[PDB]
Design a protein around this ligand. Structure first.
Ligand SMILES: Cc1cc2nc3c(=O)[nH]c(=O)nc-3n(C[C@H](O)[C@H](O)[C@H](O)COP(=O)(O)OP(=O)(O)OC[C@H]3O[C@@H](n4cnc5c(N)ncnc54)[C@H](O)[C@@H]3O)c2cc1C
Ligand code: PCD
Ligand code: SF4
Ligand code: FES
Ligand code: FES
Ligand code: FES
Ligand code: FES
Lengths: 323, 161, 761, 157, 48, 48, 48
């Protein structure tokens, strides 16, 4: 038998019920558990209860709104998203990102809400209880020192979620439900660049749905880099959305992942109006480099992770431009 | 705490008092005693614990038993009809898609989910479906052949073949 | 006939139905949960240990420390320096310090935390250079300089041979340490009967005989009170070819608790057991003639061996032993150092000790042949052994050699001629040869026993039971033994029930290591079947009123040679044979002739000595993405000389598995330590290849028919692993023009090579 | 219909969903998998299924599993301490109060209940306590000797 | 009385565990009565 | 239940001069043990 | 015993032996008497 704390497992049938259950102490939301269970099994958390969201009716519904917007309940699976015909034809970057996540079996149950809210990762963190207690734990959990950046002003664990960057360049919105009620924020704002408090959700809050507006003149794509061709989290991930006017960049949106404690939008206004040429690509690379903060929280080296992050940022814009 | 769990497992109705914190893997191996589903890693990395939940693949080690309430669950022990092998099992055996046999239950369940959803998968589609299932003995070549052989053996005559 | 027939493994049915019971699947309702308290320090002295609070915890049945394990163990009799539970000091993070047996997991976990241990932390060394520095603390007192073993040998006049060369080059190559990652987690089920003082073990081992010996020696318990059983085994690839500490600890706990203890291990603990391929630095120096002929070879190999002896001595000897037997080389110099480090002990891993030096040699030969304008496949054909038999300078006797056909076969199959050097930008083709022994011809323990013993039993019912101590670890030994015995007896495979690896019933076998099983247990099995055939032929002759020489056995019929009469059915002969006899039991054995056991005046030449070698030639086609630096192996054409494929279906799978494990080491696998801490302890960050990037592998079987192997067979599972590394190395050079020197050729290393080559030129 | 059943079995807390019509014998042999308790007849005639419920003997084949809710139940599997035999088990073994061994689990459980209530039973009292337990191999002689030996061994523990 | 009979249809083999004092006779009669070769039958007497 | 496994151990150990405990008896499994005519007419101690 | 076992393994490996017993014809009744095999034995257990 695999050891877990003796937690209660609540199975609410509605969001209200889920929200009320999350009011108690040391209570965590639960999607398919593909990220959380391996973490809890390794001793990364000691919950008194888990609130299963997979039993909430209608939470996994995918639909297209009146104004042509896409609405995805937080319970929809990555597989359903990657196979949804309307998403693949209209918001392909989203289907690309979802499909690039872990393995097919994980995707068959992994939810959208769970993917966005997945935990940050670090080699001093994703280790066993024996390994971590032997090393004095760390700032993110049960210790007080960060072993990657000794200053320890904060945890620098990296966010490696693949879907977030794609939703970000598609200008998606996150619908949150909590004890205070419902509220919506741009998806990019769901995250905070702090390894140990990486989400802007408050006590009792759940991500209930994601809404993606019509694309208009935008085209977007997502590109991820990993050593094996499946399962691996992104060593670097870049999503981009482009609006091309003749031979000039009318609109550009770029988001990175697998590089900072949060997936982030890269300020690229300096390229607006310009052409897409070697000179512009180089300005992108440096803009991406500035925003990024590649640290050694991964077993793979920083030099490589930064090099491919910049390289694929060019590659993905190039793919869009030449389409 | 223990709570009632109702589901259909390998074709039979189950109604058990199960710990709220019990993994589906442990429920299967220890409560029901079905040892075919294996544990090959410390969590979600190898697919040795793959089982089917409503025809789709699921990692038993990363699923709470209580999350499958009211669903149809199938393990490698359910595929044969009494002692007669299913076409998928016979193919793995005959084409040697199995050597030590440890990753086999998980590999066969992921293959079964694929074949129910896509009766005639392309080589790339087989690879994509088995992407999270690690095997250390075969080099995967004969596992792909086993799935192609099973697909043809199960495949419908009145359609393209 | 059964031999040479494509045959599903005789135990396949149980694998695909989930009926096969592996160690952790065995029911034992009375089982206590065992857990090991492992050291959090890489190097330290144990000053004190207090287990009293743990012993007082309700639900804790037993607690043990090194005070109860005064006898060390090692796979080699001359180097047993590992204690089941640590005494005086710990030498790697993970080193066992104490252990507990409790009623359940939660309680055992609490028990571990209650054990107080006082350590005096010592400096830890991660690299050979650091452990060898003057003043470095010695891991083991009998080796002050932390060098477990050094090898310094010369064959022929090397200095002279080099003076005769037209071209001389040398290069240094480094190879990350890799792990076996067999999919089944380590485990032992130990049942101690206190009423009779008997211990029975079911454990995840490839060597139940060695476990039997080490458990008896370490618990100071007579071997006749111990029974070792290997149930189904989820692979091993070398990891389990030595008795492991958790097996001994399980038995220790069971005895202390006076009951049954089930000691399961996590995947991280399985990585800690390790015993994998050591990090290795290889300096390769090759001298050639303008025509491509090899004139001389000088190589140096340094291995980071981990914290305990284990297979080290043998491993370091292997770095040079197989520099012989593949190519004709006039003179060879070999220097090597096996160094202790404060990390999990290294050990045997598929291709044991010969993989890294082989890759280095192949890569350099290919690079030099380019400078000479000679094709890489051609330069190998040029250096093949001139005649067979061939006695190497190392004293190995090559009695069969299929390299010529292997090369021609992969050359044709891969379309080498028309495609080599004429592929699209970013793609390449590489070629490499490799080989390995069909069993170390000298047992590790000198008991004067045959090298393999097989028993057969045939009673009134007509079913033949074959009893072997050999461990089928997924490779198919149970099928192999069935096939050869059935072939001799002229019966169907189905008439044979194989009972294996249970010390109370099966004849001892030395273990499934060094690819010794097919050759030795196959010969022993043939020998046993001949004994039985003789008993049956005599009874058939008597009943047919014919001469024994006249009796022919065809498809379970005993008839008079060339007669028009079909004869007696197998069952009628069995009936006749039972008269005045009752149950027939025969014994068959096999022993390697002394001449194949090296040279007595060359101490250590037993390592690398064998009855014959499996040879493999492989062509790899790969491509490189310059944006990411990622190398993709698309396909491998591999021809393997296995003497005679007893089961072509298994040979193919074994060869694909060997080539694929090489591809994993070549492209994505590597362990990583950070001041003693393991960073790769999971199968996410230790990158075993998935089915998506894994290449297609086409296998071509070559049968050189070895004069001494069972039906002419040699091994078919290790000789092909090493060749993948140099082959894809060459393909990468043709694809993007860089020459990697460090494995794995992961994206990070390739982009660094691409950035440097672009800085220059 | 199934209903929750809570009891202590062989020293361990059990909380199971058990059919209302399940016999204790079947719950023990099939649900928990403890095969020590045997079935030797078609209903209450042989004692082979004797187990302990709150220190007293009870025929598992003629007791509904739900009737032992909240009680302490013990089967032959609970008597030893890990692999070490209890004095009563060692005695049956050493004095040969057991031959084929089939009636033994039930015989030993009835003996255990006697020895807990009456530490030094007379020969007539031993016979009286084992009156419902049938044995076909021993002729009973050595079973009585076994119990007398265990009684004495438990007194000078 | 009781018999546990395991028939393997893949291999056409039968294994019996049965309440008998004469496993040899059971072996003979099962083979003859099922008209099954004796070499496909295995008889085991567990505790009796 | 009569003790043939013990009987066989006793006489074999006596001849060999070893202790009873050095003998493991495996019995009545047709794939492993030599055929025996059966436990009837009290033939076992004498013949086996 | 263990030292001898060790010596005995040299040039031999696993030892397996077979022992048998057969009742002499003289103890099998009289061929010319109908069914006298029943009641014919090597010896009798007697009880008073
Ligand atoms: C071997 C392995 C490889 C992986 N590879 C990848 C990869 O390449 N890319 C990737 O993105 N992920 C990867 N993952 C992470 C995980 O599998 C996926 O991110 C996934 O989408 C998890 O969704 P889930 O429903 O399983 O969430 P869970 O695991 O159930 O939940 C994860 C987290 O989200 C919280 N949560 C869940 N639902 C909600 C909600 N509605 N509102 C608020 N909080 C919520 C939980 O409390 C928890 O902290 C991998 C995991 C493993 C074990
Ligand atoms: N000629 C010939 C040969 C062979 N074969 C086959 O093949 C196999 C194998 O063989 P070999 O080679 O002889 O071997 P062995 O000895 O038997 O075995 C062992 C080995 O085996 C292999 N393989 C395998 N598989 C699996 N599946 N698993 C495993 O684990 C393994 N491991 C590996 C290793 S590493 Mo060491 O240990 O490092 O030393 S050594 C080793 C066999 O059985 C059979 O099936 C045939 O047929 N033929
Ligand atoms: S980044 Fe620092 S604080 Fe965060 S998990 Fe890693 S070591 Fe711990
Ligand atoms: S046991 Fe490895 S993914 Fe479940
Ligand atoms: S067959 Fe052994 S791990 Fe797949
Ligand atoms: S089984 Fe006979 S009284 Fe219960
Ligand atoms: S010992 Fe056989 S019935 Fe009692």
């Amino acid at each position: 038998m695999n050891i877990l704390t003796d937690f209660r497992t609540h199975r609410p049938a509605t969001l209200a019920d889920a929200v009320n259950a999350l009011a108690a102490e040391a209570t965590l939301p639960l999607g398919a558990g593909t990220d959380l269970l391996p973490n809890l099994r390794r001793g990364l958390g000691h919950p008194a209860a888990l609130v299963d969201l997979t039993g909430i009716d209608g939470l996994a519904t995918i639909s297209t709104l009146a104004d042509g917007s896409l609405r995805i309940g937080a319970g929809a699976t990555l597989e359903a998203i990657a196979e949804h015909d309307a998403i693949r034809t209209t918001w392909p970057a989203l289907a690309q990102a979802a499909e690039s996540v872990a393995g097919p079996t994980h995707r068959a149950a992994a939810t959208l809400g769970g993917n966005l809210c997945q935990d940050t990762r670090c080699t001093f963190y994703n280790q066993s209880e024996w390994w971590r207690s032997g090393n004095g734990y760390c700032l993110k959990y049960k210790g007080d020192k960060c072993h990657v950046i000794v200053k320890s002003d904060r945890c620098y664990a990296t966010y490696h979620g693949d879907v977030a960057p794609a939703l970000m360049v598609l200008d998606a919105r996150a619908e949150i439900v909590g004890p205070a009620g419902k509220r919506t924020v741009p998806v990019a704002q769901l995250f905070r660049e702090s390894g140990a408090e990486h989400l802007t959700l408050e006590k009792g809050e759940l991500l209930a749905a994601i809404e993606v507006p019509p694309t208009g003149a935008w085209s977007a794509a997502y590109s991820k880099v990993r050593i094996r061709d499946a399962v691996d989290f992104p060593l670097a991930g870049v999503a981009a959305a482009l609006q091309r006017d003749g031979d000039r960049i009318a609109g550009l949106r770029v988001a990175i992942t697998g590089s900072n404690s949060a997936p982030l939008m890269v300020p690229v206004d300096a390229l607006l109006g310009g052409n897409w040429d070697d000179a512009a690509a180089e300005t992108l690379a440096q803009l991406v480099r500035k925003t990024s903060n590649v640290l050694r929280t991964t077993i793979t080296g920083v030099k490589y992770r930064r090099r491919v992050l910049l390289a694929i940022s060019r590659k993905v814009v190039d793919q869009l431009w030449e389409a | 705490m223990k709570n009632i769990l109702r589901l259909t497992l390998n074709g039979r109705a189950r109604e058990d008092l199960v710990p709220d914190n019990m993994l589906l893997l442990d429920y299967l191996r220890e409560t029901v005693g079905l040892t075919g589903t294996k544990q090959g890693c410390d969590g979600g990395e190898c697919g040795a614990c793959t089982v089917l939940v409503d025809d789709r693949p699921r990692l038993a080690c990363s699923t709470l038993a209580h999350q499958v309430a009211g669903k149809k669950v199938e393990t490698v022990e359910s595929l044969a009809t009494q002692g007669t092998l299913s076409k998928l099992q016979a193919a793995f055996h005959e084409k040697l898609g199995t050597q030590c046999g440890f990753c086999t239950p998980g590999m066969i369940m992921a293959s079964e989910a694929l074949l129910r959803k896509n009766p005639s998968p392309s080589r790339d589609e087989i690879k994509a479906a088995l992407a999270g299932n690690l095997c250390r003995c075969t080099g995967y070549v004969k596992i792909i052949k086993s799935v192609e052989t099973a697909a043809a053996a199960r495949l419908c005559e009145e359609g393209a073949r | 006939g059964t031999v040479g027939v494509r045959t599903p493994l005789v135990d396949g049915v149980e694998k695909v139905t989930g009926k096969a019971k592996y160690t952790a699947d065995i029911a034992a309702p009375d089982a206590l949960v065992g857990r090991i308290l492992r050291s959090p320090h890489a190097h330290a002295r144990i000053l004190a240990i207090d287990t009293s609070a743990a012993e007082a915890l309700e639900g804790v049945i037993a607690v043990c420390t090194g005070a109860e394990t005064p006898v060390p163990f090692g796979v080699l009799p001359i180097a047993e320096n590992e204690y089941p539970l640590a005494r005086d000091k710990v030498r790697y993070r993970g080193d066992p310090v104490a252990a507990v047996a409790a009623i359940d997991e939660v309680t055992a976990e609490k028990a571990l935390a209650l054990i107080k241990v006082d350590y005096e932390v010592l400096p830890a060394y991660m690299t050979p250079k650091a452990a060898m520095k003057a003043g470095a603390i010695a891991l083991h007192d009998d080796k002050p300089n932390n060098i477990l073993r050094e090898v310094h040998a010369e064959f022929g006049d090397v200095a002279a041979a080099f003076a005769e060369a037209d071209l001389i080059r040398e290069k240094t190559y480094t190879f990350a340490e890799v792990n076996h990652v067999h999919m089944e987690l380590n485990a032992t089920l130990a049942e101690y009967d206190p009423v009779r003082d008997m211990l029975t073990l079911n454990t995840t081992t490839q060597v139940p005989y060695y476990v039997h010996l080490k458990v008896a020696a370490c618990l100071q318990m007579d071997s006749a009170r111990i029974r070792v059983i290997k149930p189904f085994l989820g692979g091993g690839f070398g990891a389990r070819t030595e008795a492991l500490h958790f097996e001994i600890i399980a038995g220790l706990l069971a005895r202390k608790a006076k009951g049954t203890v089930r000691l399961l291990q996590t995947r991280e603990e399985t990585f800690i057991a390790h015993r994998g391929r050591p990090w290795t630095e290889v300096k390769m120096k090759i001298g050639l003639k303008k025509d491509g002929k090899i004139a001389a070879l000088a190589l140096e190999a340094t291995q980071a061996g981990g914290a305990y002896a284990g297979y080290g001595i043998i491993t370091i000897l292997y770095t040079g032993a197989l520099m012989h037997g593949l190519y004709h080389i006039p003179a060879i110099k070999h220097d090597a150092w096996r160094v202790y480090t404060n990390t999990p002990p290294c050990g045997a891993m598929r291709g044991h000790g010969t993989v890294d030096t082989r890759a280095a040699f192949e890569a350099l030969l290919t690079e030099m042949g380019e400078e000479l304008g000679i094709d890489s496949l051609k330069i190998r054909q040029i250096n093949m052994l001139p005649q067979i038999p061939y006695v190497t300078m190392y004293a190995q006797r090559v009695m069969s050699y299929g390299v010529p056909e292997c090369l021609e076969k992969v050359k044709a199959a891969s379309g080498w001629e028309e495609r080599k050097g004429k592929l699209p930008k970013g793609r390449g083709l590489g070629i490499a040869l490799s080989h390995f022994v069909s069993g170390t011809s000298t047992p590790k323990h000198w008991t004067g026993e045959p090298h393999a013993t097989v028993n057969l039993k045939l009673d009134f019912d007509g079913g033949i039971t074959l009893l072997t101590g050999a461990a089928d670890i997924g490779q198919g030994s149970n099928t192999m033994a069935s096939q050869v015995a059935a072939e001799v007896l002229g019966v169907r495979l189905s008439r044979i029930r194989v009972i294996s690896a249970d010390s109370a019933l099966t004849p001892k076998d030395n273990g499934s290591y060094s690819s010794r099983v097919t050759f030795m247990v196959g010969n022993a099995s043939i020998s046993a079947a001949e004994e039985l055939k003789g008993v049956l032929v005599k009874a058939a002759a008597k009943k047919l009123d014919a001469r024994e020489e006249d009796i022919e056995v065809i498809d379970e019929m005993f008839m008079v040679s060339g007669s028009q009469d079909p004869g007696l059915s197998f069952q009628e002969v069995v009936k006749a044979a039972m008269v005045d006899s009752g149950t027939i039991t025969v014994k068959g054995t096999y022993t390697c002739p002394t001449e194949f056991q090296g040279d007595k005046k060359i101490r250590g030449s037993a390592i690398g000595a064998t009855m014959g070698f499996c040879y493999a030639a492989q062509v790899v086609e790969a491509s490189v993405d310059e944006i990411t630096g990622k190398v993709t192996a698309h396909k491998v054409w591999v021809a393997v000389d296995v003497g005679k494929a007893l089961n072509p279906l298994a040979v193919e799978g074994q060869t694909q598995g060997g080539v694929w494990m090489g591809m994993g080491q070549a492209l994505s696998e590597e362990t990583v330590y950070d001041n003693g801490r393991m960073v790769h302890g999971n199968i996410l960050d230790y990158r075993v290849p998935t089915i998506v990037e894994s290449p297609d592998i086409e296998v071509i079987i070559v049968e050189s028919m070895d004069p001494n192997g069972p039906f002419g067979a040699k091994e078919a599972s290790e000789g092909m692993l090493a060749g993948f590394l140099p082959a894809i190395h060459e393909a990468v050079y043709e694809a993007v023009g860089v020459r990697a020197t460090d494995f794995p050729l992961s994206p990070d290393r390739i982009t660094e090579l691409l950035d440097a080559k672009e800085a220059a030129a």
